[PDB]
Amino acid sequence: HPMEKAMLKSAFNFSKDIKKLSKKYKQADDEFFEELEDVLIQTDMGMKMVLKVSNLVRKKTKRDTSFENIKDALVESLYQAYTDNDWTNKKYRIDFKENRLNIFMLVGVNGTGKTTSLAKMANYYAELGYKVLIAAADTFRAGATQQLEEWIKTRLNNKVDLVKANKLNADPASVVFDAIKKAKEQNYDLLLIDTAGRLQNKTNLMAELEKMNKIIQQVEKSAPHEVLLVIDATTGQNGVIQAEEFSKVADVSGIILTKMDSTSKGGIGLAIKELLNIPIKMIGVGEKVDDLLAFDIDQYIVHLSSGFM
DSSP states (O other): OOHHHHHHHHHHHHHHHHHHHHHHHOOOHHHHHHHHHHHHHHHTTOOOHHHHHHHHHHSSTTOOHHHHHHHHHHHHHHHHHHOOOOOHHHHOOOOTTTTEEEEEEEEEOOOHHHHHHHHHHHHHHHTTTTTTTEEEETSSSTHHHHHHHHHHHHHTTTEEEEEEOSOOOOOOHHHOOOOOOHHHHOSHHHHHHHOOOOGGGGHHHHHHHHHHHEEETTTTOOOSEEEEEEGGGGGHHHHHHHHHHHHHOOOOOOOEEEEEGSOOOHHHHHHHHHHHHEEEEEEEEESSOOOEEEOHHOOOOOOHHHHGG
C-alpha cells in the first residue's frame, strides 16, 4: 500500500509523541489535556483543529478512562474533525464522466508541482484506457512547456498528447482554445489544462482563469469539471495559508496534496479542511509517474494513527 508510504514519516512522529505521553499518564485531567494539545499542535493541524479535536476527545472521555481508550477517542475525534461527520463520497470524487469531454484545470504556486501533477493525473487516466490531452497554457513561465514535453516524451502512456503555444500566439487563452478544439474534434476523454497566473497579481490570475472559463464553456457548459489546487505537504501550515489565497481568487474544487511521504506533519490534511474547506482528491506519494492516488480519509486516519494502534 502507498498510504503506508505516504503516512510513514508522519505516523512515526505522531506516535513517538503519543507514546511519550503514555509514560506520564495517570488521569485525563486538565493538565493531561494540555499536554495532548501540544502533541496535536505538533502534527500541524492548526489551532482551530487542535481545539476541536481536544474538546471532542474530552467529551468522549472521563477522568478515569484508560490510555487505550484515550487513543480510540483521539482517532475518532481526528476523523470527526476532518469529515465533520458527513457523507464524503461525492465531495471527494473527481467528477469524471464517460461520455463527455472532461476538462480539469490545475492551479498552484509551484510551477513544477503543477506540471508533475498534470503529468501524473494524465497517466492515471491514460492507464485506465482513456484518451488524454494536456494543454501547456502556463506560457509565461520559462520551462513549463519543456517539462510537459519531457513527461510525454519519456514517462507517459502514448494515449497522452500535448498542445503547446507556437511563436505567433503564446497567449495562455490561445493554447486553451486550440486544446479544446482539438479535444472535441478528435474525441479525447480528458483535457488537462496547466493554467496561467501568479498570486503576485491576483487581478491577472483571476483574469487569465476567466478568459479560460469562457473558452471551454463554449463547448462544455459544465466545464471546468475540476479545478485542482496543488499543495506541497512539505510547505506545512504556511503553504496551506498561501494556498487559501488561491481558492479565494479561483473556483477551486479539489486539492492535490503532493509529497506527503516527505512530511512528518500528519495534521496537514486537517489544516487544509479547516483553512480552505476544499476536499483533498488526490495525494502524491512518490516522485515516479504513478505515485499518485485517490485520497481516502479512512486510510489517511488509519495510517496516521497506525503507530499507536
